[PDB]
Amino acid sequence: GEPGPPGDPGLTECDVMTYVRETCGTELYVAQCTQRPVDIVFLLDGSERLGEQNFHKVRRFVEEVSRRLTLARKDDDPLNARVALLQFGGPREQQVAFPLTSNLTVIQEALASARYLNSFSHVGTGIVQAINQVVQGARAGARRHAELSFVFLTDGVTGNDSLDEAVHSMRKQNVVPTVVAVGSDVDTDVLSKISLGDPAAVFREKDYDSLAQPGFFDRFIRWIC
Amino acid sequence: GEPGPPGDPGLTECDVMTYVRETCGTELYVAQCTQRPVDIVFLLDGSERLGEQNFHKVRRFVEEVSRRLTLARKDDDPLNARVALLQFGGPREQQVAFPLTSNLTVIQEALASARYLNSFSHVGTGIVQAINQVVQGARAGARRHAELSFVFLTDGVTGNDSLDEAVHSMRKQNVVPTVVAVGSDVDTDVLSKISLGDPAAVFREKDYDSLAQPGFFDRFIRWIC
Amino acid sequence: SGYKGSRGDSMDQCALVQSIKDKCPCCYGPLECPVFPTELAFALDTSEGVTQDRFSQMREVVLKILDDLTIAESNCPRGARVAVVTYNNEVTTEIRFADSKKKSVLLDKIKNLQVSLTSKQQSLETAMSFVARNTFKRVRSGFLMRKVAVFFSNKPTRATPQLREAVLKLSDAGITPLFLTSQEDRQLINALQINNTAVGHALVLPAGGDLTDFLKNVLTCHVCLDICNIDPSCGFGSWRPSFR
Amino acid sequence: SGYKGSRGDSMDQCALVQSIKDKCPCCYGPLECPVFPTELAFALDTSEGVTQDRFSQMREVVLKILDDLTIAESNCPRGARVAVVTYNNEVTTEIRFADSKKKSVLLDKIKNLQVSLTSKQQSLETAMSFVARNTFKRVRSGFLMRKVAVFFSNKPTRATPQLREAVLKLSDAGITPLFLTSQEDRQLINALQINNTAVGHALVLPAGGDLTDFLKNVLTCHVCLDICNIDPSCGFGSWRPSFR
Amino acid sequence: GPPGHVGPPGPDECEILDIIMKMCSPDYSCPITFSSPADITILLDGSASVGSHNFDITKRFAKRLAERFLTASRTDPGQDVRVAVVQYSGTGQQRPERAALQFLQNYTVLANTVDSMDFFNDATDVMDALGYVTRFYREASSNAAKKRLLLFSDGNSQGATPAAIEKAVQEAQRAGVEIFAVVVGRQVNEPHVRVLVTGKAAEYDVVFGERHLFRVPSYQALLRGVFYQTVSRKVALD
Amino acid sequence: GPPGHVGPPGPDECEILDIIMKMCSPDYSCPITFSSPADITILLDGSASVGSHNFDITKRFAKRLAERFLTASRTDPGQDVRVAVVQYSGTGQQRPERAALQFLQNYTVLANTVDSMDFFNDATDVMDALGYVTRFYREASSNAAKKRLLLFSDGNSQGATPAAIEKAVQEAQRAGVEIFAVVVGRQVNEPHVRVLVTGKAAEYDVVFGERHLFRVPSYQALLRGVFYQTVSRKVALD
Ligand SMILES: *[C@@H]1O[C@H](CO)[C@@H](O[C@@H]2O[C@H](CO)[C@@H](O[C@@H]3O[C@H](CO)[C@@H](O)[C@H](O)[C@@H]3O)[C@H](O)[C@H]2NC(C)=O)[C@H](O)[C@H]1NC(C)=O
Ligand SMILES: *[C@@H]1O[C@H](CO[C@@H]2O[C@@H](C)[C@@H](O)[C@@H](O)[C@@H]2O)[C@@H](O[C@@H]2O[C@H](CO)[C@@H](O)[C@H](O)[C@H]2NC(C)=O)[C@H](O)[C@H]1NC(C)=O
Ligand SMILES: *[C@@H]1O[C@H](CO[C@@H]2O[C@@H](C)[C@@H](O)[C@@H](O)[C@@H]2O)[C@@H](O[C@@H]2O[C@H](CO)[C@@H](O)[C@H](O)[C@H]2NC(C)=O)[C@H](O)[C@H]1NC(C)=O
Ligand SMILES: *[C@@H]1O[C@H](CO)[C@@H](O[C@@H]2O[C@H](CO)[C@@H](O)[C@H](O)[C@H]2NC(C)=O)[C@H](O)[C@H]1NC(C)=O
Ligand SMILES: *[C@@H]1O[C@H](CO)[C@@H](O[C@@H]2O[C@H](CO)[C@@H](O)[C@H](O)[C@H]2NC(C)=O)[C@H](O)[C@H]1NC(C)=O
Ligand SMILES: *[C@@H]1O[C@H](CO)[C@@H](O[C@@H]2O[C@H](CO)[C@@H](O)[C@H](O)[C@H]2NC(C)=O)[C@H](O)[C@H]1NC(C)=O
Numbered sequence A, B: 001g002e003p004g005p006p007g008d009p010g011l012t013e014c015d016v017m018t019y020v021r022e023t024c025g026t027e028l029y030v031a032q033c034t035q036r037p038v039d040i041v042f043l044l045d046g047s048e049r050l051g052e053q054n055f056h057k058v059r060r061f062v063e064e065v066s067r068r069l070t071l072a073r074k075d076d077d078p079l080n081a082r083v084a085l086l087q088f089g090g091p092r093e094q095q096v097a098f099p100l101t102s103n104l105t106v107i108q109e110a111l112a113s114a115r116y117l118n119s120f121s122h123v124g125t126g127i128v129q130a131i132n133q134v135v136q137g138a139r140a141g142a143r144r145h146a147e148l149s150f151v152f153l154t155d156g157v158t159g160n161d162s163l164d165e166a167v168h169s170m171r172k173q174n175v176v177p178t179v180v181a182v183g184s185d186v187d188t189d190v191l192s193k194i195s196l197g198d199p200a201a202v203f204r205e206k207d208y209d210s211l212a213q214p215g216f217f218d219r220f221i222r223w224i225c
Numbered sequence C, D: 001s002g003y004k005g006s007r008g009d010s011m012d013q014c015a016l017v018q019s020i021k022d023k024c025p026c027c028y029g030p031l032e033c034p035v036f037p038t039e040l041a042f043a044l045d046t047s048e049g050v051t052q053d054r055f056s057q058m059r060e061v062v063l064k065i066l067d068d069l070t071i072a073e074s075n076c077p078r079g080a081r082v083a084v085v086t087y088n089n090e091v092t093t094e095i096r097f098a099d100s101k102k103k104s105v106l107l108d109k110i111k112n113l114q115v116s117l118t119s120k121q122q123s124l125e126t127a128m129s130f131v132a133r134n135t136f137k138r139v140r141s142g143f144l145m146r147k148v149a150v151f152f153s154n155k156p157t158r159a160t161p162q163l164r165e166a167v168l169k170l171s172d173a174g175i176t177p178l179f180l181t182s183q184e185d186r187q188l189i190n191a192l193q194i195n196n197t198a199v200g201h202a203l204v205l206p207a208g209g210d211l212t213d214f215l216k217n218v219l220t221c222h223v224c225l226d227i228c229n230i231d232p233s234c235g236f237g238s239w240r241p242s243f244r
Numbered sequence E, F: 001g002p003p004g005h006v007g008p009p010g011p012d013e014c015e016i017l018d019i020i021m022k023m024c025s026p027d028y029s030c031p032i033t034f035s036s037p038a039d040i041t042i043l044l045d046g047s048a049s050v051g052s053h054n055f056d057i058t059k060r061f062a063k064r065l066a067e068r069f070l071t072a073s074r075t076d077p078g079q080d081v082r083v084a085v086v087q088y089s090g091t092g093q094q095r096p097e098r099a100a101l102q103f104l105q106n107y108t109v110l111a112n113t114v115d116s117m118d119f120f121n122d123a124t125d126v127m128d129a130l131g132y133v134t135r136f137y138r139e140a141s142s143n144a145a146k147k148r149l150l151l152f153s154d155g156n157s158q159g160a161t162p163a164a165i166e167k168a169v170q171e172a173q174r175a176g177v178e179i180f181a182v183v184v185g186r187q188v189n190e191p192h193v194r195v196l197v198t199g200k201a202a203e204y205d206v207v208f209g210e211r212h213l214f215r216v217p218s219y220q221a222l223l224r225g226v227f228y229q230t231v232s233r234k235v236a237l238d
């Protein structure tokens, strides 16, 4: 075929602009995934504003994400990362799901029978129950320093009876928040509180179906690892 | 399958908008082609700024246009429209081309042997030569009132030694123009002069290749017919 | 899936204009014709035997009609656009829909318009077709656009299929012709109208004397007739508001 | 067609800033560290036997280091970001890269930070890995982004392969660590340095007495060393421009 | 498949009014006349599907609706113009007390109740809400008056099947009150809201359908413009 | 296919000066120094491919170039700094006559000639133009001076082949003048322009091409910004 097109400029205009701004005076650079010891526990609110079809789409997204990430063999601080999910709700004041575990078949089986609450859910009670459950699991799984990152898959608009206390407890519990809001309708206060004073620790997706968009999936997997 | 979607609202916001603007206080409505007696003569200036490959593209465009429009059998004021084209230049102060005729085989042969001038076009001399030639042809073809429309395939940037006199001759010769400029670089003066004081008698094409865009081709055939 | 559902209802064409009219300040006070923006196409005739004085009379008639009407100088869809042509066995455009931009310049052009004495014999059907398929090749947009053509004749038209076909084409084109000629012809009225459906009347003009009567008739209930409030008995017939 | 051409030449990272720096008014007058916006990560050790008075000493050291440095309160790529953590057999983040927004609030938080008296036995490798793969999990952008970590130890480190692997990972992460400990260990230097190419010095800290003698060195020479105008003979070794 | 149902008819008087008033520079606002005595009780959503700020904007819109209806010059001093407000939530959650709220001419109790209700944080429940509304009408409203009603809905509620809502709306019709549906957003079970509007799923009358349904894209858009004027005027017209 | 050649290097001093001055707010503008005496004769297009207005903006750019070069503080009063201007067109059209124009120092006469030249409306001929330039230098410029030249072109010319351009540029090189190419737009015969820039088609040097080529997308953008000063300073640097 024909010769390839000529190369781009050595230092484009934006390059020099960034240089000058840097000397005297967005996007954040994160080192790509390296299978570092990680432990992630999702959180999907049961509020009826989610949607049965949207619940199915979120199930698909979660299983795809679990497929993409490498899964550790076991515990006692090997390399690789684990995964957990729960679907707490308002009614019954409690709900449970599978604990952290890398055995993917358990994940598939639990997801298959996943029940969509379609009911109110106060985020504070959910998060405190989640942190209690994951603390219990971690204690059952030795020290495994690694980390503890929580991904909030929800708009977050819900009852805040004990939001602040749970946020404080999570803050003291060496956690790394991360939020993926869906839809234009979102309250900035809840996002800010969960983000722990970060402007770029939140992603936005116009529709729940976009969770299957390859671009957003790649960005999310890059951010988490 | 599933039922169709709901229909268009009653007097859509734009509908009432136009109604109110009309009551007290763009696009022009043209009756679709009805094969009324029309005589059309093209004009492709040989200015070196056209391009040999762009000349081939214009040849293809003219071929397509002459193919789509219906062609009359003969003269003496029958229905249907004819076609003509010429490629006048500046050097040698003249050029010749096939006259108005519906024998598409002659059009094919002329296009096949079509020579890209890569030369100049004192648009005034070219247009006066064209009007003389088409007047001679029309006289050879009886009255055939019909009409006489010219299509200008040129940016128009060129020497204007005798532009105004030829413009006046065109005015007196019951002519109707239609100009399709291509490229950002265009002079408003020449376009206005050849458009005969019209703001919507000019089409703008981003690039020569856009001449093959079905949308623009359909719009052009709709305007001319 | 099924195709798109049917277009819904509407508030009719006229009565909505009545409503918006009462409600838009200063637009129900001083009326100015045309009632709605419209195209007007004058077509003069130079057929042999046309007396120059009669040409002057028609020139005065057209000038008065223009002055009584405003124009749409800008691109705002409000006001009258004009197009003046001359016709014979052939046709020759003089001023088209685009050149005219100011009332004074249009009046000056029309007054200074060349008078072309000639001898070619009349053929009104050619002018009919010309206006049908050349002058109205492009017209300004507007949901309530009105289009009117005014013609001339120094001799009654013949009775042939070509003219009836031509007027059918005119009607199909949306025009609302108002012919003017010295004397009536029941055949002309019959050919113009169709199946008890009028296309456009054929008035009468004088060989000298008073003009304000018929001039008033045309200016009120023909050239700038409100599509909504048609006068009680201005012109015997049935009228035909809106497109045809 | 063939693939895209190669990247073009560059004016070199070092002296383009030299040029722009002699060129951006008032930016070549008063100096304020850090020379370029950078991340600084303090990690504190609560290892068994860490004397509380010594903890106060390190607290004052960190407080002074913070005061000497400015902060990037806004999102403009200019100023210092901070991250303070405590490490033991396990680790516990105290303040991350996000919460810090003002100098006074940061100073108050660090001064009011709880002292976690404990008895767990130390293992510096866990803290190395934590900082390598958790603290720097995300950092601010910038073509000349600079990263630095400061640590502590109330006991000399062991001589094990895992330490070499951890320091290799740190180097791969772009960090430029500056450890601090009571007493030297040639084995520590050897593990840090790679084939005679240093990765980070291991300075010394006092059990009392004067401090500024080494505070000046650390501040002028490691934390906010100029990228290109390096001090002639500060610290035995070979220095490093940035990255590895 | 079969073609879709006819789309909504054109702008009514009140939005053509504000569109003309926007630029054309004669009465304005959006006048109303209660031709015959009647009542209205705008029902407000309180399920989580709305949310805090959405619930608050709905409260504001309800307040505006009530004030506009009450201020509208009564067509007869010898008779009354009557409005009321109540909040519905999960089963058996409909403030105020049964005997508490009557038809009102003043604005004290109505305004305080409008600005004092609380979000409930429970799944949408339409059955008991509709039963409460219809029984309250049956017991309270005077026999002669021909009343009207409005409702926010999403067609979603636990333990909801089309036949049950068919029966409930049939009971409401037996009570003898026409109903109108106003909804916000598109995350709505279309068949259920269509049923609620019509009462006969098989025969969805186009005229009854389009007239009785108002659609809004977003909660914020509900308050913007003169939509409130249009809905109130449409409620007024018999 | 094979990969494309290396792209243009990073921006030089002048435009980085401009960008720092744009927002960062010491001598500025774009100082030049003619280290050693030389000559420059900016060659301006005269074929229709440019046009009337585009030819006018080219004339303005030429006038500015002459002003900036002449005003540049001569590095030595003992020797001179030399500039000239000519317009080329179809075969045998290079104003002024061969014996008229010398190296000019006062700016007014050169400026008057620049503002008085008329568009030729003759085909794009580059053979005779290059011959004119090279023979004029051969006859005129003093032996010691090592000169420089600019040239506008599109690489398109009737009766032109790569061999002819190569031979002409070789003759110019034998005359002993290095050449630089500045072009506008992209309706350009890339091989011919590259050959003119280098003269060694097969062994084209990427560094030579990138150093000796200037690309401007639009005629209007040519005068805009600091492009003129950047190119003039590049001409200045050895
Ligand atoms: C761990 O992952 C497995 C899938 O890899 C989960 O489901 C397991 O699926 C296999 C496939 O049929 C079942 O086969 C059984 O395996 C056992 C050995 O574990 C073997 O002794 C049986 O004869 C049979 O082949 C397996 O039963 C099934 N796991 C369980 C617990 O029933 C599994 O649920 C995941 N969690 C575990 C194993 O705790
Ligand atoms: C509610 O009504 C009271 C008084 O009732 C008025 O007379 C009724 C027959 C009927 O026509 C109501 O609509 C009238 O408003 C209004 O003002 C109260 O007046 C009494 C009389 O002294 C006084 O004691 C109260 O404090 C007044 N209420 C106040 C000050 O809030 C009252 O304005 C009406 N509601 C609103 C919202 O204004
Ligand atoms: C154009 O040149 C003339 C005279 O040249 C001057 O002397 C040369 C040696 C060289 O140094 C040029 O740069 C000088 O400008 C300038 O105008 C003339 O000036 C003289 C002295 O005042 C006067 O007698 C003449 O009448 C002037 N000629 C005129 C008015 O036509 C002129 O300034 C130069 N143009 C510039 C500098 O743009
Ligand atoms: C929960 O959060 C809200 C706001 O984030 C707190 O206050 C509410 O603020 C919104 C702002 O739009 C108002 O509309 C509400 O009216 C406020 N609450 C009330 C009761 O009026 C609220 O205090 C927090 N906690 C609780 C228990 O609601
Ligand atoms: C006119 O059209 C015809 C076809 O409609 C063209 O084709 C030639 O027609 C003549 C008529 O007898 C034949 O003898 C030739 O053999 C046809 N050409 C070929 C290639 O078969 C004709 O060429 C057109 N007129 C002209 C002048 O070319
Ligand atoms: C018509 O011809 C005249 C000269 O015969 C042209 O006049 C020039 O127009 C350009 C347009 O910007 C001006 O910049 C020049 O200053 C004018 N004069 C000269 C001497 O160039 C005119 O441009 C031509 N019209 C066109 C090309 O549309």
Ligand SMILES: *[C@@H]1O[C@H](CO)[C@@H](O)[C@H](O)[C@H]1NC(C)=O
Binding pocket: C194, C195, C196, C197
């Ligand atoms: C008959 O009269 C009607 C009445 O307007 C008209 O629309 C129609 O075109 C006429 N011709 C035919 C064939 O119906």
Ligand SMILES: *[C@@H]1O[C@H](CO)[C@@H](O)[C@H](O)[C@H]1NC(C)=O
Binding pocket: D194, D195, D197
């Ligand atoms: C060897 O030194 C080079 C040069 O600094 C360095 O890049 C590399 O990582 C070193 N490798 C080892 C094994 O020391």
